[PDB]
Amino acid sequence: SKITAAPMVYVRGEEMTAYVMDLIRSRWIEPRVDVGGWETFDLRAKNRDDTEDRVLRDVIEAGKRIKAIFKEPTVTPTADQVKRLGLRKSWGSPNGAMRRGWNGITISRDTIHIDGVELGYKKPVLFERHAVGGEYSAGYKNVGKGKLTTTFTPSEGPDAGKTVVVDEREIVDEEAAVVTYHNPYDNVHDLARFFFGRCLEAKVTPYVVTKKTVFKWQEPFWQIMRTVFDEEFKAQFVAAGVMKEGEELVHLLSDAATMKLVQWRQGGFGMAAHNYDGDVLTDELAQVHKSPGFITSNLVGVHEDGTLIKEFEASHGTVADMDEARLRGEETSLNPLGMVEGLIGAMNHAADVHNIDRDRTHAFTTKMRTVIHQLFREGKGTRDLCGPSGLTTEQFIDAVAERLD
Amino acid sequence: SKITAAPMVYVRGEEMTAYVMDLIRSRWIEPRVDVGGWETFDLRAKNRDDTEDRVLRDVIEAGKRIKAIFKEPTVTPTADQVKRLGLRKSWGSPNGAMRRGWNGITISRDTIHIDGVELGYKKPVLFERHAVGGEYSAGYKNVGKGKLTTTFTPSEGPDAGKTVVVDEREIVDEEAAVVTYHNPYDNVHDLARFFFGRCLEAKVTPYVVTKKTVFKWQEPFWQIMRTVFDEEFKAQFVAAGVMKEGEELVHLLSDAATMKLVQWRQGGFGMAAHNYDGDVLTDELAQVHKSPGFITSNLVGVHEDGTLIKEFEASHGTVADMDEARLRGEETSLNPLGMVEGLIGAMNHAADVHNIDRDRTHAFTTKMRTVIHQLFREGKGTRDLCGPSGLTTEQFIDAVAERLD
Ligand SMILES: NC(=O)c1ccc[n+]([C@@H]2O[C@H](COP(=O)([O-])OP(=O)(O)OC[C@H]3O[C@@H](n4cnc5c(N)ncnc54)[C@H](O)[C@@H]3O)[C@@H](O)[C@H]2O)c1
Ligand SMILES: NC(=O)c1ccc[n+]([C@@H]2O[C@H](COP(=O)([O-])OP(=O)(O)OC[C@H]3O[C@@H](n4cnc5c(N)ncnc54)[C@H](O)[C@@H]3O)[C@@H](O)[C@H]2O)c1
């Protein structure tokens, strides 16, 4: 009998990655797995516009109920796409909304390692991206000349109820952006614990990455991480052989960290950073390693009731350059491994949390990984790995299908 | 006779780069050059503290008068360094202050190429970093729970004098950063002209880099760039064979652009970006190429009277990690070429704008460049280029000194 898929949220996107995942669902999953328990949502920018984002609100609700989500890449539409797609409005990112809506703590993005496949980093690299805050949460306007005033009224402490000026400035340009955001730092305690725990288990040296010299408001990110490190982890790292006695936790400036990602080809390190810095640095990490096909991503959030909410995704976008080529009848070669690891993670988590066909799901998802890893080993991967002699998107999908059984 | 140095502003920093420039001034410059016309300023974090940043205000004024500045790297002190260095407060960056104070348009950061020396990028890469805006001039506070409100009152147009809410949010964290900034976009018209003109002359394909999908306030950066391109440059790029007919200006997402910097090892491209994106991406550019010793940096600003204000600098910081090694008595190997190119640029510009010993200054600055390039060609460069067999900082400085005359 087909495997019974456990309840799981499936978020569909568009462009090349939706095309790829339709093939994978059709040729790898459905002949072996009954997916009736999946809740599938259409997060095409068009459908979001048609539903006034009710579909996004529904994904967020379902994630709370089900706790295991696979998220395909989605489009955050440009002004030019607003016209081409016939959207009544620009729409923001559905990723920020989900990350916020699930009380996101960390987006973990780690390098993939396959026995016998030489990649950019020799040993595992771990990345913890702060899942919320920063410019992803910003209010803004595009304006001309005028007065911009920011105030804060605390609700606790000796100055409760009194308003202070955070900033006031005259805009003297006919064209300017004015932007306000916050960084919520309470859950950076949780992030630090999670990050240092994983680094300890993988035996990699941790680094904290910020621009706190100039972006001085970021100081608590560093201070919280250092305090958690010193009080809960420093001794464990020394005892495990990962760091030496008297070796302090190291801070890197975000610009310098881009240099460390190129330089540190041995791997064997971890970085934690704010939301946007993590976005930039994890794409860089992907390309140094090989491509975004060789990175895993997952979000850890928390339900109001305290149970974890786990979303799994590729690190990358919808691969619009290959989509253009696809629609013109030209060859493409999208590496599905990143996305597939996400779907594996989500399916395994779903089966464990909801106690449905656990053994068989784990064996099947392990099999998908194995087959993919073996094709890569045999030089029958996609072109990101193998160069021009690699297989096309469709060739690779079929090669996996033949070996699954 | 020693060469007469033209009036020029010289900004000294601290740590390793100040140590190196002290040696270079002593051993390369002063034996051949009378530096009496230089106006030198001490921007040690301690001296900024001792003078309440009067020294920084003096630099900015002198820059306006003299229009040719060499800026060594400086320390923007951390909270931790405030204590160690005995500072009354955590001073901001001198760089942001100078960039604003000189009506900064562009920070041009370009790859260095030396005949016969294999580096990361085969052909020239050009970067235009918007010199002002963004989080570099943010107002901010670190706060607890309360109400954050941002308002804007336009001074022109039909709603002049009426106040609108830009943003309002409740902070629910005990520890949060609240931040307001602006991006001034009027001078992006000038940046676009300077960028496309430079790319046209170098015959490189230009790209614009932003996060305008999610950071939607950035749209005008792209639109301004694209309009200037379409109206003033596209036809010229086609005519010069740099782009084909019907080929549009390409936009890249900032996170994706980090991948393009690793992948595009052929070089022969240009990127333009906002202030912070430029900071991050130009450090990455440096490391992919070889190190920060193989990048040039200069700031183009504009005096109230319309005259160019040109500041020259290395792309990098004070190289604190080598300074710590130096002070423990360990070997170092700082590549001075980045900084030296800045000093060259500033000396030449000074001689030209103030009409003092031009031929001889140009010959001597060319000689410094030639001697450095030749040592690199001979495998007698610093360890960033040559590996462990390369010269120490001091060996390299002495090697150049011996060949100067
Ligand atoms: N998490 C997300 O949902 C997410 C992330 C990034 C971008 N996007 C969206 O995706 C679209 C495209 O953005 P983009 O072009 O900047 O980013 P992208 O990650 O789709 O592509 C960037 C580059 O990497 C390559 N690439 C990415 N994944 C690959 C894979 N698995 N195999 C081989 N090559 C791969 C692409 O061909 C392209 O050259 C946009 O609409 C953007 O809003 C979404
Ligand atoms: N323009 C500036 O004034 C500027 C820029 C960046 C950092 N800083 C300041 O510099 C200090 C150090 O910051 P950082 O360590 O993040 O940056 P950094 O640029 O000093 O060093 C970053 C890394 O690059 C290496 N490196 C840099 N320049 C080099 C060269 N010429 N040759 C060989 N290796 C080189 C360093 O050894 C280090 O590993 C901080 O106090 C910071 O505020 C100043």
User: What HEC string does chain B produce?
Assistant: CCEECCCEEEEECCHHHHHHHHHHHHHHHCCCEECCCEEEEECCHHHHHHCCCHHHHHHHHHHHHHCEEEECCCCCCCHHHHHHHCCCCCCCCHHHHHHHHCCCCEEEEEECCCCCCCCCCCEEEEEEEECCCHHHHCEEEEECCEEEEEEEEECCCCCCCCCEEEEEEEECCCCEEEEEEEEECCCHHHHHHHHHHHHHHHCCEEEEEECCCCCHHHHHHHHHHHHHHHHHHHHHHHHCCCCCCCCCCEEEEHHHHHHHHHHCCCEEEEEEECHHHHHHHHHHHHHHHCCHHHEEEEEEEECCCCCEEEEEECCCCCCHHHHHHHHCCCCCCCCCHHHHHHHHHHHHHHHHHHCCCHHHHHHHHHHHHHHHHHHHHCCCCEHHHHHHHCECHHHHHHHHHHHHC
Please state, in angstroms and as integers, the Cα–Cα distance from residue A280 to each residue in A37, A276, A330, B93, B211, following that order.
35, 6, 30, 23, 10
Q: Which of B90, B141, B259 faces A284 most closely, judged by CB atoms? A: B259
> Quick one: tokens of B145?
């729970």
> Please, are residues B180 and B139 in contact by the beta-carbon 8 Å criterion?
yes
Q: Which of A96, A136, A177 faces B217 most closely, judged by CB atoms? A: A177
- Euclidean distance between the first and the last CA atom of chain A, given in angstroms as a whole number: 14
Residues of A in contact with B138 (CB under 8 A): 167, 215, 217
> Please, are residues A37 and A382 in contact by the beta-carbon 8 Å criterion?
no
B76 is in an annotated binding site: yes
> Please, are residues A200 and A232 in contact by the beta-carbon 8 Å criterion?
no
Measured CA to CA, the distance from residue A150 to residue A166 in angstroms comes to 5
> Is A135 within 8 Å of chain B by CB?
yes
CA of B77 to the centre of ligand 2 (A): 13
Atom of ligand 2 nearest to the CA of B314: 1
Residues of B in contact with A139 (CB under 8 A): 150, 166-169
> Is B252 within 8 Å of chain A by CB?
no
A74 is in an annotated binding site: yes
Measured CA to CA, the distance from residue B163 to residue B176 in angstroms comes to 26
> Quick one: tokens of B19?
């140590």
Experimental method of this PDB entry: X-ray
Half-sphere exposure of A121 (CA within 13 A, CB side): 28
| Bridge partners (DSSP) listed for residue A312 | A70, A298
DSSP label at A382? Answer: B
The residues near B208 (Cβ < 8 Å, ≥ 6 apart) are B221, B222, B225, B226, B249, B250, B251, B252, B271, B272, B273
> Please, are residues B14 and B44 in contact by the beta-carbon 8 Å criterion?
yes
Indicate which ligand has the atom closest to the C-alpha of B18. 2
> Please, are residues A23 and A395 in contact by the beta-carbon 8 Å criterion?
no
Contact assignment for B180 to A150 by CB distance below 8 Å: yes
What single-letter amino acid sits at A117?
A: V
Q: Is A291 in the pocket of ligand 1 (CB under 6 A)?
A: yes
> Please, are residues A284 and B259 in contact by the beta-carbon 8 Å criterion?
yes
Measured CA to CA, the distance from residue B4 to residue B369 in angstroms comes to 19
Measured CA to CA, the distance from residue B367 to residue B359 in angstroms comes to 12
Q: How far is B318 from chain A (nearest CA, A)?
A: 12
Q: Which of B147, B280, B288 faces A262 most closely, judged by CB atoms? A: B288
Task: Identify the CA nearest to A183 among candidates B277, B165, B174, B137.
Answer: B174
Cβ under 8 Å to A: B residues 76-105: 76-79, 90, 92-93, 96
Map residue A57 onto helix, strand or coil: helix
Q: How far is A351 from chain B (nearest CA, A)?
A: 34
Measured CA to CA, the distance from residue A251 to residue A272 in angstroms comes to 10
Atom of ligand 2 nearest to the CA of B313: 1
Please tell me what resolution, in angstroms, this structure has: 1.9
Residues of A in contact with B220 (CB under 8 A): 142, 175, 177
Helices B219-228 & B188-202 angle (0-180, nearest 10):
50
> Please, are residues A396 and A333 in contact by the beta-carbon 8 Å criterion?
yes
Task: Identify the CA nearest to B299 among candidates B277, B271, B275, B318.
Answer: B275
Contact assignment for B214 to A144 by CB distance below 8 Å: no
Q: Is A299 in the pocket of ligand 1 (CB under 6 A)?
A: no
The residues near A405 (Cβ < 8 Å, ≥ 6 apart) are A32
> Quick one: tokens of A142?
């595009």
> Please, are residues A161 and B237 in contact by the beta-carbon 8 Å criterion?
no
Q: Which of A152, A174, A220 faces B146 most closely, judged by CB atoms? A: A152
| Bridge partners (DSSP) listed for residue B34 | B4
Measured CA to CA, the distance from residue A208 to residue B122 in angstroms comes to 33
The residues near A324 (Cβ < 8 Å, ≥ 6 apart) are none
Q: B59, B93, B95, B319: which to mutate for ligand 2, most atoms within 8 A of CB?
A: B319
Measured CA to CA, the distance from residue A63 to residue B157 in angstroms comes to 46
Please state, in angstroms and as integers, the Cα–Cα distance from residue A135 to each residue in A28, A272, A293, B146, B162, following that order.
39, 17, 27, 19, 26
